[PDB]
Structure formats: C-alpha cells, structure tokens
Amino acid sequence: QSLQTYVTQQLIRAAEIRASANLAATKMSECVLGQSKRVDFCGKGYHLM
Amino acid sequence: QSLQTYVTQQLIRAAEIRASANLAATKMSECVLGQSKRVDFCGKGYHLMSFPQSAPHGVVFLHVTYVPAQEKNFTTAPAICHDGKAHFPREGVFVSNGTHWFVTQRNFYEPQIITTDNTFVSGNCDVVIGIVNNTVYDPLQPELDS
Amino acid sequence: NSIAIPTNFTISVTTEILPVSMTKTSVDCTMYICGDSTECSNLLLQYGSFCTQLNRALTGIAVEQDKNTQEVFAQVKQIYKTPPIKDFGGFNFSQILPDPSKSKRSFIEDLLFNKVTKFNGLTVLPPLLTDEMIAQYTSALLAGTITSGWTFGAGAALQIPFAMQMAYRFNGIGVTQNVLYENQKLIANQFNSAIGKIQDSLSSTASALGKLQDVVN
Amino acid sequence: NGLTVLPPLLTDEMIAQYTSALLAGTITSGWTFGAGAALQIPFAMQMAYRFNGIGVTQNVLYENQKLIANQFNSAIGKIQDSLSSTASALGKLQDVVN
Amino acid sequence: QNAQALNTLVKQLSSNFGAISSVLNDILSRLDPPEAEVQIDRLITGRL
Amino acid sequence: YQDVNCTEVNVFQTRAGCLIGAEHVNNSYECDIPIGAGICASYQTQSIIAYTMSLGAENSVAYSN
Ligand SMILES: *[C@@H]1O[C@H](CO)[C@@H](O[C@@H]2O[C@H](CO)[C@@H](O)[C@H](O)[C@H]2NC(C)=O)[C@H](O)[C@H]1NC(C)=O
Ligand SMILES: *[C@@H]1O[C@H](CO)[C@@H](O[C@@H]2O[C@H](CO)[C@@H](O)[C@H](O)[C@H]2NC(C)=O)[C@H](O)[C@H]1NC(C)=O
Ligand SMILES: *[C@@H]1O[C@H](CO)[C@@H](O[C@@H]2O[C@H](CO)[C@@H](O)[C@H](O)[C@H]2NC(C)=O)[C@H](O)[C@H]1NC(C)=O
Ligand SMILES: *[C@@H]1O[C@H](CO)[C@@H](O[C@@H]2O[C@H](CO)[C@@H](O)[C@H](O)[C@H]2NC(C)=O)[C@H](O)[C@H]1NC(C)=O
Ligand SMILES: *[C@@H]1O[C@H](CO)[C@@H](O)[C@H](O)[C@H]1NC(C)=O
Ligand SMILES: *[C@@H]1O[C@H](CO)[C@@H](O)[C@H](O)[C@H]1NC(C)=O
Ligand SMILES: *[C@@H]1O[C@H](CO)[C@@H](O)[C@H](O)[C@H]1NC(C)=O
Ligand SMILES: *[C@@H]1O[C@H](CO)[C@@H](O)[C@H](O)[C@H]1NC(C)=O
C-alpha cells in the first residue's frame, strides 16, 4: 500500500507535468514558431517573438 | 483494495480523456467552425479549414492546410528611397530579381510594379538602415498628362 | 538583404486523431467483491460507505463520457444537410460526406471504424448518442462547413458558394484571393488527390489510429 | 533497492541541439519554418512583420531600429544578471525536482 | 461534490472495519492493551 | 432494468434495457432525462414518455454556386 500510494501520486503528478508539457508544446508552436494575438499568453505586452 | 485500485486508475484515466476532449472540443470550435490563426494547432502549415469525421471512442480531423512549396531567392530592402521620401510596402515586401524592383505579397511570389497605391511614405531616406534607391510609378501621372 | 519567397504551394490534408470518451463502465461493487452470498455481504457492510464511494466514482466517470461526446460533437445548433447538386467549385467531398446507401457514415468515416477493435458484476453501459447519431452530427458540422463557411458557428448558416469560401480561407492566411481563382482547378485537384491519400493511408495501415486503439487497449 | 532511474531518450546535449535549431530557424526565417519551408528573411524585415502583427505600422521599427536593437540587447542582458544574481526564478523546476 | 466527499469521510468514523466497536474511547474503556491494540489496529487500517 | 430482456422481469425494450412505466412515442423531442442508445424520457401530455431524441431541427442550407 506504500507502493500503491507512491504510484498513485506519481500518476497524478505526471498528469500535472503533462498539462504543463502540453502548455509548453502549445507556447512553442504558437509563440516560437509563430506570433500570438492571444492577450497575456506570451508575456505581458503585445507579443513580438 | 483491487477495486479501489482500479477505480483510482480509472478516475485518473478519465481525467486525461476529459483533457483530450476539451482539446477536441476546441479543435472543433476553432478548426472546423472557424479558421484558427494558431500555429500548428490545426495541423502543420497555414490553416485553411477542417472536416470532422467520427471514429469509435474519438474524433478525427482532416485539417486542410496551405503549405508554401517552391521557394526562389531574391534581393530585398526594408524600404525604397524615391525623391528623398522613404516608401514602405502596405501588405507586401520589396524584392528584386537583380535588375528590377517589385513589391510582392509575403506568402506567394506575385511581383507588382511599385506605386503610391501599394506603398506608403514616412520620414526621409537618411533614417532607415539598408534602404535602396528606386522609381515609384505614380498612377495619376499619365492621366494628369492626358 | 536576401529573402526567399514561394513561387508555388501545396495543400495538405493532414489527419489528426483525438480520443474523446472511454467505454462507459460500471462495476456493481457488492457483486464483484462478494457475489451471490449474504453470508459475505453482511461482512462487507463493516467497511461502511466504501462500496457507495466506488459506485459513485464509476458513475461520475460514466456520465462524463456522455458529457465529453456531447461537448465535442453537439456544437452545431441544428442538423444542416447538403444540397442534391454537389456544385462545390471542383472540390470533391464524396469521401467525407455521408453515403445514403449504407450506419450512414462517410467513406473515410467507415475506414476509421474498420481500423479499430465480463459478467462478475461488471456492466458496460451504452453511450447516450448512438454511433449513427455521432455520424449525423459530423454530417451536420460538415454540411455547415461546406455550404456556409464559419458563419454557422457565429449565427445563422448563411450560404456562400465554396470557391468564395476558400477565397475567404486564403485571404485569412495573408494570400490575396486572386491566387485562388487563378489556380482554382489546380487547388481542387490538389485537395481531391490529398483526400485520396487519406483513403490509401487509412486502408493500408492501422498504425495511424494508435491514439484510439491505445485508449481501447 | 528495487528503485531505478531511467535515462531520457533525448540527452541534455541533444535537447540543446533542438533549442538551437528552433531559435536558429526563428532568427533566420521568422515563423515560416513552422509552415514547412525555412524561408530566409533579414532580421530587421522579420521584426517589421512582427510589428505589423501588433498593429504598429512598420516604419516605427525602421525609424527606431538602433533604439529597438539596443532595448532588446539591454533587456536580454538583464536576464543573465537576473539568472546569475538569484536562483529563485527557477522555482517551478527546482520544485518538480524536490 | 466536496460536501458529499467530506460527509462520507465523516460517516466512515461510524464504521467498524471488523473491530468490536465503532468508538475508540469504548474500546479503551473495555479492553487491556494486548487486545485493544488488535481492535485499534483494525480501526487504524480502515480509517487510514 | 439495465441490460435485461423484458421476458426475465406499458413496457418498452430499449437498447439500454427493459423500460417499464414509460410510454414509447414515435415523435422526437430534445433530450430531457437521458437513458442510452439515443433514447431519452420526459414528463409530457401528463405522463412519462420515452422517445428517440432529436439532435435538432433539420435544415437544408439553400446553397447554389
Ligand atoms: C526581372 O523582371 C523583369 C520584368 O519581368 C524582366 O524584364 C523583362 O525581361 C523580358 C525578357 O526576359 C523582356 O522581354 C521584357 O521586355 C523585360 N521588361 C522590362 C520592363 O524590362 C527582367 O529581365 C528580369 N531580370 C532578371 C535578371 O530575371
Ligand atoms: C540614393 O540616391 C540619392 C540621389 O541620387 C543619392 O544622394 C546623392 O549622394 C551623393 C554621394 O553619394 C551626393 O554627392 C549627392 O549630393 C546626393 N544627392 C542628393 C540629391 O542628395 C544617394 O547617395 C543614393 N544612395 C544609394 C545607397 O544609392
Ligand atoms: C506548381 O506545382 C504544381 C504541382 O503541385 C504544378 O502543377 C503541374 O504542372 C505541370 C506543368 O504545367 C503539369 O504537367 C502537371 O500536370 C501539373 N500537376 C501536377 C500535380 O504536377 C504547377 O504547374 C506548378 N506551378 C504553379 C505556379 O502552380
Ligand atoms: C468525386 O470522386 C469520386 C471518386 O472518389 C468520383 O466517383 C467515381 O466516378 C467515376 C465516373 O466519373 C466512376 O467510374 C467511379 O466508379 C466512381 N467511383 C466511386 C468510388 O464512386 C466522382 O465522380 C467525383 N465527383 C466529382 C463531382 O468530382
Ligand atoms: C539561395 O542562395 C544561396 C547562395 O547565396 C544558396 O545556398 C541557397 O541554396 C539558395 N536557395 C534557394 C531556395 O535557391
Ligand atoms: C550587409 O553586410 C555588409 C558587410 O560588409 C555591409 O557592407 C552591408 O551594408 C550590410 N547590409 C545591410 C542591409 O545591413
Ligand atoms: C427477448 O427474449 C425473447 C424470448 O422469447 C425473444 O423472443 C426476444 O427476441 C428477445 N428480445 C431481445 C431484444 O433480446
Ligand atoms: C407508431 O408507429 C406504428 C406504425 O409503425 C403505429 O402502429 C403506432 O400506432 C404508432 N404509435 C404512436 C404512439 O404514434
């Protein structure tokens, strides 16, 4: 039950880190490979690059 | 304990399927019901439109995308100097084939003669780094001449 | 001082596959743990509300699978349908629009089904929307998208002829719309042949649908 | 003790090759390397396309190019100073390690 | 959802989990530690 | 009664199971109480009905080239 508790919290933590990896994959596509008209998505101010 | 384990994995798996839904619901509302401006959200290339298709326990998008495909090199300059005025392109970019200067749209080679319609003035030729001298054709000139 | 500019282009129909709902499952936790025997069930009562927590949690998952499938497909207000005359400016949607001879799925929407694949108190519940109702929503979303641009999402489905819709799509990517009209037959052949490669890809290999088959597995 | 740590598939010296490719694309070719083709474009012309992308018409860049370049160079220099003078900026990464 | 999850966590204090009583002060009123530790360890195992 | 056939139990055999005390109707309405496999139930002219749900009004878009 100590392993099941650890694995359960790593599964939840991995979903939290994947929500951040999907956000990072999104910022890389929409702000490195592009320019964003999405307000406050890529820094404060109007986004340049 | 084996049922508590299963329903715990199943709550965590249902949470990540509810996260591929919402992603699929926004690809529906942005790629299908609109035209997303968002780079690589609706497939690689510039987005044109998408068609949803059903699939068992999922959805499939056929993202129709424009991809620019046969590039040529050109010489270019940020502005053209005319009679001391610096002219900048409206929606285009300036290019040259080495002998003549044109303004073209940015995502397809479409050379146009440079005129006071497709360009706008600001300041003078001293300020801009890398400006080049050229003619600007004035569309009014032959009409006012006749 | 050097810029490269494309003298030509290609239109690519890149497929993307997303899972949307699990198989709705509920496990009758008393009959799973402790089946067909009151002599056992009176011992399971000492664990109190545990078996109610597990039925509650699996019912929460099971109603979310209908909610997901509604949130994805049921975005269209009313079920648009295409005209009899398929006059779409040379573009050929016959492989993605529903076939009335069939289960009224499109051609590609059938390849997608053919490529993809218990009594111990376990139950599998049906989805709220039949797979044929999902095929009506994808038909309506697609019939709006072909006959009426984006404006069926924003309000009334105002018709617009398809060679003017793709000119609005081109203008939306900063390509001046005359680039479409001067190339419309080439653009139609690029789209139609790119749609043809989707049948050939989905017919030839199952490896495309790995995201859905993983969620089934 | 039964516990193990597996290597990442992309080594750190190979992630740094992708970040180099991503910004070396971005610096030489704008966004276009996302849309298939890495079309070269001189950088003061890429920034004029990015000024149009915020509704500041492009002669504002050229008439201020030395100022805008100096503001960028100064601003990126302050990131070295920030990341040298405190470790507290990487709170999210040090927290996922913790 | 929070109120019903928390009321269920509280109702699980009324559950025996195989102990002789639901109430830990009653186990400690009835039994000496060599046996009360077995009863309490069923309640610990269940409540935990 | 989920998954059963009514012979094992105003009765209707839905694809979800045997439904007892709801009047089946040939009409369609928006969904109200969801059952499964396109069936929904509601309280209407009153009594409990069950029906195949309507996804919305049909609309032929007036397209021409
Ligand atoms: C640059 O573009 C111009 C315009 O197309 C070219 O000038 C024309 O060249 C053709 C022969 O290739 C002649 O028949 C035309 O009379 C020319 N027109 C003018 C206005 O001069 C020019 O040749 C191109 N230069 C290069 C190096 O490609
Ligand atoms: C662009 O054209 C102008 C006008 O012909 C050039 O200005 C002349 O520059 C020379 C020195 O190079 C001076 O002696 C003249 O007095 C200038 N004339 C005027 C009217 O100002 C300018 O140098 C050219 N620049 C480039 C890069 O070609
Ligand atoms: C752009 O590329 C397309 C192909 O994607 C070219 O279309 C071909 O053109 C040749 C020569 O006219 C024909 O023989 C072929 O039958 C056409 N189809 C294909 C698929 O190759 C097109 O000519 C190119 N040029 C432009 C500006 O569109
Ligand atoms: C749209 O594409 C389909 C093929 O996917 C075309 O259907 C074929 O049409 C020819 C006659 O032109 C028949 O010999 C074939 O048997 C048809 N194939 C199938 C699978 O039905 C259709 O003609 C095209 N329509 C338009 C308007 O372009
Ligand atoms: C552009 O010119 C350079 C040489 O100056 C060459 O290396 C490059 O391949 C050319 N690109 C195209 C698209 O012709
Ligand atoms: C390009 O670089 C050369 C290096 O000698 C320089 O002479 C020229 O002025 C530069 N052009 C621009 C537009 O910066
Ligand atoms: C229900 O069972 C009876 C048994 O006689 C059979 O006739 C009928 O076809 C069955 N219907 C369904 C839907 O299972
Ligand atoms: C439903 O349709 C059948 C014929 O298919 C008919 O006999 C029956 O009376 C109808 N019932 C209702 C409630 O309309």
CA atoms of C21 and C23, how far apart (whole Å): 7
Closest CA to C196 of C204, C207, C184: C204
User: D82: buried, middle or exposed (CB in 10 Å: 19+, 13-18, 0-12)?
Assistant: exposed
Q: Which chain B residue has its CA at the smallest distance from D66's CA?
A: B129
Nearest CA to ligand 2 atom 27: B132
- Are C79 and F31 an interchain contact pair (Cβ–Cβ within 8 Å)? no
Ligand 8 pocket residues where CB is under 6 Å: F 25-26
- Count CA atoms within 13 Å of residue B47 on its CB side: 24
Q: Is the dihedral angle over the CA atoms B101, B103, B107, B110 positive or is it negative?
A: negative
- Are B38 and A33 an interchain contact pair (Cβ–Cβ within 8 Å)? no
- Collect all residues of chain B within an 8 Å Cβ-Cβ radius of residue D43: none
Q: Which helix or strand (DSSP H or E) is residue C60 part of?
A: helix C50-73
**Phi, psi at residue D97, to the nearest 5°?**
-65, -45
- Are D39 and B128 an interchain contact pair (Cβ–Cβ within 8 Å)? no
Judged by its nearest atom, the ligand closest to the C-alpha of residue C179 is 3
What SS3 class is residue D20? helix
The region, left, alpha or beta by phi > 0 then psi within -120 to 50, assigned to residue C107 is alpha
- Collect all residues of chain C within an 8 Å Cβ-Cβ radius of residue B91: 174
**Ligand 2 geometric centre to CA of B91 (Å):** 28
Looking at residue E10, its amino acid is V
Question: What share of residues in chain C are helix, strand, coil (percent, to 5)?
Answer: 55, 10, 35
CA atoms of D20 and E12, how far apart (whole Å): 56
Nearest CA to ligand 6 atom 7: B130
How many angstroms away from the CA of B141 is the closest CA of chain A? 39
What SS3 class is residue B24? helix
CA atoms of A39 and D87, how far apart (whole Å): 29
**Ligand 3 geometric centre to CA of C215 (Å):** 42
- Classify strands B80-81 and B132-133 as parallel, antiparallel or unpaired: parallel
The region, left, alpha or beta by phi > 0 then psi within -120 to 50, assigned to residue B125 is alpha
C-beta of residue C133 within 8 angstroms of C-beta of residue F31: no
Q: Which residue has the tokens 């039949």?
A: C130
In three-state form (DSSP H/G/I as H, E/B as E, the rest C), the secondary structure along A1-49 is CHHHHHHHHHHHHHHHHHHHHHHHHHHHHHHHCCCCCCCCCCCCCCCCC
How many angstroms away from the CA of A1 is the closest CA of chain D? 16
C-beta of residue C15 within 8 angstroms of C-beta of residue C201: yes
Going by the DSSP 8-state scheme, the letter that residue B66 receives in this structure is E
C-beta of residue B65 within 8 angstroms of C-beta of residue D36: no
Q: Is the dihedral angle over the CA atoms E29, E31, E34, E36 positive or is it negative?
A: negative
C-beta of residue B34 within 8 angstroms of C-beta of residue C148: no
Show which of residues 27-86 on chain B sit within 8 Å of chain C, judged by CB atoms: 27-29, 32-35, 37, 43-77
**Phi, psi at residue D11, to the nearest 5°?**
-65, 155
CA atoms of B70 and C188, how far apart (whole Å): 19
- Are F16 and C159 an interchain contact pair (Cβ–Cβ within 8 Å)? no
Residue from F12, F23, F24, F26 whose mutation best tests the ligand 8 pocket (most atoms within 8 A of CB): F26
| DSSP class per residue in C131-191 | HHHHHHHHHHHHHHHHHSTTHHHHSS-----HHHHHHHHHHHTT--THHHHTTHHHHHHHH
- Are E15 and C52 an interchain contact pair (Cβ–Cβ within 8 Å)? no
**Ligand 2 geometric centre to CA of F25 (Å):** 89
Show which of residues 93-132 on chain B sit within 8 Å of chain C, judged by CB atoms: 93, 95, 104-110, 130
Looking from the CA of residue C88, the nearest atom of ligand 4 is: 27
Beta-bridge partner residues of B54: B59
- Are C4 and D37 an interchain contact pair (Cβ–Cβ within 8 Å)? yes
C-beta of residue C29 within 8 angstroms of C-beta of residue C56: no
What kind of experiment solved this structure?
A: cryo-EM
The region, left, alpha or beta by phi > 0 then psi within -120 to 50, assigned to residue B84 is left
Q: In a mutagenesis test of the D interface, which of A32, A40, A44 is the best target, namely the one with the most D β-carbons within 10 Å?
A: A32
- Collect all residues of chain E within an 8 Å Cβ-Cβ radius of residue C47: 15, 17, 46
CA atoms of A19 and B124, how far apart (whole Å): 51
Looking at residue B7, its amino acid is V
- Are C46 and E11 an interchain contact pair (Cβ–Cβ within 8 Å)? no
Nearest CA to ligand 6 atom 6: B130
**Phi, psi at residue C85, to the nearest 5°?**
-80, 110
Q: Which helix or strand (DSSP H or E) is residue F3 part of?
A: none
Within 8 A by CB and 6+ apart from E25, the residues are none
- Are C159 and F56 an interchain contact pair (Cβ–Cβ within 8 Å)? no
Q: In a mutagenesis test of the B interface, which of C16, C32, C151 is the best target, namely the one with the most B β-carbons within 10 Å?
A: C16
CA atoms of D39 and B69, how far apart (whole Å): 10
Within 8 A by CB and 6+ apart from B4, the residues are C50, C54
Within 8 A by CB and 6+ apart from F16, the residues are C125, C126, F2, F3, F35, F36, F37, F39
